[PDB]
Amino acid sequence: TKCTLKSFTVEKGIYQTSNFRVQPTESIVRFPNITNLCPFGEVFNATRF
Amino acid sequence: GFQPTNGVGYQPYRVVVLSFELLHAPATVCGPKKSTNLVKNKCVNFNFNGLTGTGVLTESNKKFLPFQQFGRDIADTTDAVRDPQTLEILDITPCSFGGVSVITPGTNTSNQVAVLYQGVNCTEVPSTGSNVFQTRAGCLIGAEHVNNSYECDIPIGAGICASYQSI
Amino acid sequence: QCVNLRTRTQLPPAYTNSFTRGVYYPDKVFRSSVLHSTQDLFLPFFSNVTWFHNPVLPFNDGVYFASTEKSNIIRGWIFGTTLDSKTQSLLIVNNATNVVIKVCEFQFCNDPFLDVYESGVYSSANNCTFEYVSQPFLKNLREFVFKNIDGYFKIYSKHTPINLVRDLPQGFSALEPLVDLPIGINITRFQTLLALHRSAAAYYVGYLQPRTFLLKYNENGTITDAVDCALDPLSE
Ligand SMILES: *[C@@H]1O[C@H](CO)[C@@H](O[C@@H]2O[C@H](CO)[C@@H](O)[C@H](O)[C@H]2NC(C)=O)[C@H](O)[C@H]1NC(C)=O
Ligand SMILES: *[C@@H]1O[C@H](CO)[C@@H](O[C@@H]2O[C@H](CO)[C@@H](O)[C@H](O)[C@H]2NC(C)=O)[C@H](O)[C@H]1NC(C)=O
Ligand SMILES: *[C@@H]1O[C@H](CO)[C@@H](O[C@@H]2O[C@H](CO)[C@@H](O)[C@H](O)[C@H]2NC(C)=O)[C@H](O)[C@H]1NC(C)=O
Ligand SMILES: *[C@@H]1O[C@H](CO)[C@@H](O[C@@H]2O[C@H](CO)[C@@H](O)[C@H](O)[C@H]2NC(C)=O)[C@H](O)[C@H]1NC(C)=O
Ligand SMILES: *[C@@H]1O[C@H](CO)[C@@H](O[C@@H]2O[C@H](CO)[C@@H](O)[C@H](O)[C@H]2NC(C)=O)[C@H](O)[C@H]1NC(C)=O
Ligand SMILES: *[C@@H]1O[C@H](CO)[C@@H](O[C@@H]2O[C@H](CO)[C@@H](O)[C@H](O)[C@H]2NC(C)=O)[C@H](O)[C@H]1NC(C)=O
Ligand SMILES: *[C@@H]1O[C@H](CO)[C@@H](O)[C@H](O)[C@H]1NC(C)=O
Ligand SMILES: *[C@@H]1O[C@H](CO)[C@@H](O)[C@H](O)[C@H]1NC(C)=O
Ligand SMILES: *[C@@H]1O[C@H](CO)[C@@H](O)[C@H](O)[C@H]1NC(C)=O
Ligand SMILES: *[C@@H]1O[C@H](CO)[C@@H](O)[C@H](O)[C@H]1NC(C)=O
Structure with missing residues (x-):
């Protein structure tokens, strides 16, 4: 209060000093299901090349 | 001349060469995505299917049509999303904020004060001080609620105000 | 079965009135009980x-296609520029089991018909790039909207139980998005496909232009009404 008002003595009243806000805790990543794999096993595990 | 006894140099080796092309046509193959888990009722940030933003996620009763992926309200602000896996409607609320004010009787009289957080629920203040009061104007810390009534010394709001007797 | 059927059928193409048909959801955003103004092709x-x-008709920038069909004689669509093996071409057909979509360089017959005895329209098929199979699209009214932009081919659709006899009704109904294709192509002209048994089809074609519309979203996020923004001073 003294710093914002720039004085060593403060008169009776109510004064607005600063702002308040909540901070985020963690992060969340969401994405659709993993499906429709690229066929690589059949080629790499193929008997005949 | 592949034979079982031919040494390392003559062994039959199967070789596959993979080449990647990224022509001007839209991409069709990509790697995994590695989605994380879900939390609720906490101020967190998120990137739902590439849509980023912070806030708190709650359960919502809005009913999407089967083809929307999210929703926004007037003035173009996103309000709801649909999780790509469970396919349910979640609601987004910005994390709380406000201003702080100090009530003092004057340095001439004393030097103890009370604090008011404007428009903030009395659940996430932090820090303890004294008993904490919840008013229509916000949350107040450092004053005692009484049942009497007097004139108004230091107006606080919503029909209540404070004075020094303690505060 | 590359056979010819007719040479000069009913030549004069009729004209009729569009009224207030051909509205589709322009995005995947949900809105409830609100008026929204948007500029796009309608x-x-x-x-x-x-x-x-x-005949082969121009595609311009987009196409609205309508059919007051019964027994679904129409079968599919063909898109391209040269309509031969020298350029990309897109083919869509709908048989009794699964709608089929292909992107190849065909040699379509000059009078490409399916008939029953998935060939008889193209004399060749090579260098195919995209394939797709899904559930088939189809006194019924079938409305479709075809758009192509940013290497993406968008298809919107709607089916309606129609009781009127001759032409489009005086009603309102939005069109849901159906399919998107991430394939680059330069469609400029197209053609309709019919499968007639070896032994005269009524449909409607309209073209799209860029302009602004006002749309009303009800509580459940469904478009219930719209206003064209250049029809008359009251609309402005
Ligand atoms: C993504 O995969 C998960 C894992 O299987 C699916 O979750 C299961 O879905 C079935 C189908 O209804 C339920 O019977 C199970 O109880 C679910 N298990 C859970 C939630 O742990 C999920 O449905 C899939 N999402 C899709 C395919 O969109
Ligand atoms: C501060 O938050 C609490 C917690 O949500 C609110 O208490 C809820 O109030 C609603 C409606 O009054 C009830 O349906 C919930 O059951 C309450 N939950 C709990 C845990 O008490 C409280 O109302 C909020 N403060 C203000 C001033 O609204
Ligand atoms: C309809 O078109 C499909 C397009 O592939 C034809 O092909 C069969 O479709 C069924 C549907 O699942 C598959 O089980 C078969 O394996 C497909 N055949 C082949 C050779 O792959 C289908 O035959 C057509 N049906 C009719 C009645 O025309
Ligand atoms: C088969 O079709 C593909 C695309 O559908 C053609 O790919 C071309 O590839 C070259 C170099 O990779 C590019 O410069 C061209 O722009 C591509 N063309 C198109 C239309 O995308 C491929 O040339 C075709 N092959 C044959 C034999 O027709
Ligand atoms: C449609 O045809 C045009 C040619 O008129 C293609 O535009 C060319 O695109 C390549 C790749 O970016 C450029 O290097 C050329 O300079 C472009 N030519 C012109 C005349 O602009 C366009 O790519 C074709 N559409 C698709 C989807 O391939
Ligand atoms: C919009 O959504 C509401 C909420 O679901 C619909 O109201 C329901 O309609 C069904 C069908 O008649 C009734 O069986 C339910 O009882 C209704 N719910 C309630 C709470 O009354 C409404 O029909 C939908 N459409 C419109 C145009 O409002
Ligand atoms: C091939 O099969 C073996 C069998 O154990 C497995 O260990 C290996 O991962 C497979 N590789 C591919 C590419 O599928
Ligand atoms: C408070 O103010 C009174 C006059 O109003 C003065 O006499 C007194 O000295 C002051 N006390 C302080 C400044 O501590
Ligand atoms: C009086 O004040 C006390 C303490 O603030 C409070 O608990 C009580 O509800 C008030 N009213 C009565 C009738 O006691
Ligand atoms: C279309 O234009 C023709 C003249 O070319 C006119 O006779 C007909 O009434 C018009 N149809 C409309 C505006 O629906």
Whole structure:
């Protein structure tokens, strides 16, 4: 209060000093299901090349 | 001349060469995505299917049509999303904020004060001080609620105000 | 079965009125009980829609296609520029089990018909790039909107139980998004596909233009009404 008002003595009243806000805790990543794999096993595990 | 006894140099080796092309046509193959888990009722940030933003996620009763992926309200602000896996409607609320004010009787009289957080629920203040009061104007810390009534010394709001007797 | 059937059928193409048909959801956003103004490609209200009762027609920038069909004689669509093996071409057919989509360089017959005895329309098929199979799209009214932009081919659709006898009704109904294709192509002209047994099809074609519309979203996020923004001073 003294710093914002720039004085060593403060008169009776109510004064607005600063702002308040909540901070985020963690992060969340969401994405659709993993499906429709690229066929690589059949080629790499193929008997005949 | 592949034979079982031919040494390392003559062994039959199967070789596959993979080449990647990224022509001007839209991409069709990509790697995994590695989605994380879900939390609720906490101020967190998120990137739902590439849509980023912070806030708190709650359960919502809005009913999407089967083809929307999210929703926004007037003035173009996103309000709801649909999780790509469970396919349910979640609601987004910005994390709380406000201003702080100090009530003092004057340095001439004393030097103890009370604090008011404007428009903030009395659940996430932090820090303890004294008993904490919840008013229509916000949350107040450092004053005692009484049942009497007097004139108004230091107006606080919503029909209540404070004075020094303690505060 | 590359056979010819007719040479000069009913030539004069009729004209009729569009009224207030051809509205589709322009995005995947949910809105509830709100008015929203958007600028995009639409079919102007009370426009002149061409009635056919079957040549190659221009695509321009987008196409609205309508059919008061029964027993689904129409089968599919063909898109391209040169309509031969020298350039990309897109083919869509709908048989009794699964709608089929292909992107190849065919040699379509000059009178490509399916008939029953998935060939008889193209004399060749090579260098195929994209394939797709899904559930088939189809006294019924079938409305479709075809758009192509940013290497993406968008298809919107709607089916309606129609009781009127001759032409489009005086009603309102939005079109849901159906399919998107991430394939680059330069469609400029197209053609309709019919499968007639060896022994005269009525449909409507309209074109899209860029303009602004006002849309009303009800509580459940469904478009219930719209206003064209250049029809008359009251609309402005
Ligand atoms: C993504 O995969 C998960 C894992 O299987 C699916 O979750 C299961 O879905 C079935 C189908 O209804 C339920 O019977 C199970 O109880 C679910 N298990 C859970 C939630 O742990 C999920 O449905 C899939 N999402 C899709 C395919 O969109
Ligand atoms: C501060 O938050 C609490 C917690 O949500 C609110 O208490 C809820 O109030 C609603 C409606 O009054 C009830 O349906 C919930 O059951 C309450 N939950 C709990 C845990 O008490 C409280 O109302 C909020 N403060 C203000 C001033 O609204
Ligand atoms: C309809 O078109 C499909 C397009 O592939 C034809 O092909 C069969 O479709 C069924 C549907 O699942 C598959 O089980 C078969 O394996 C497909 N055949 C082949 C050779 O792959 C289908 O035959 C067509 N049906 C009719 C009645 O025309
Ligand atoms: C088969 O079709 C593909 C695309 O559908 C053609 O790919 C071309 O590839 C070259 C170099 O990779 C590019 O410069 C061209 O722009 C591509 N063309 C198109 C239309 O995308 C491929 O040339 C075709 N092959 C044959 C034999 O026709
Ligand atoms: C449609 O045809 C045009 C040619 O008129 C293609 O535009 C060319 O695109 C390549 C790749 O970016 C450029 O290097 C050329 O300079 C472009 N030519 C012109 C005349 O602009 C366009 O790519 C074709 N559409 C698709 C989807 O391939
Ligand atoms: C919009 O959504 C509401 C909420 O679901 C619909 O109201 C329901 O309609 C069904 C069908 O008649 C009734 O069986 C339910 O009882 C209704 N719910 C309630 C709470 O009354 C409404 O029909 C939908 N459409 C419109 C145009 O409002
Ligand atoms: C091939 O099969 C073996 C069998 O154990 C497995 O260990 C290996 O991962 C497979 N590789 C591919 C590419 O599928
Ligand atoms: C408070 O103010 C009174 C006059 O109003 C003065 O006499 C007194 O000295 C002051 N006390 C302080 C400044 O501590
Ligand atoms: C009086 O004040 C006390 C303490 O603030 C409070 O608990 C009580 O509800 C008030 N009213 C009565 C009738 O006691
Ligand atoms: C379309 O234009 C023709 C003249 O070319 C006109 O006779 C017909 O009434 C018009 N149809 C409309 C505006 O629906």
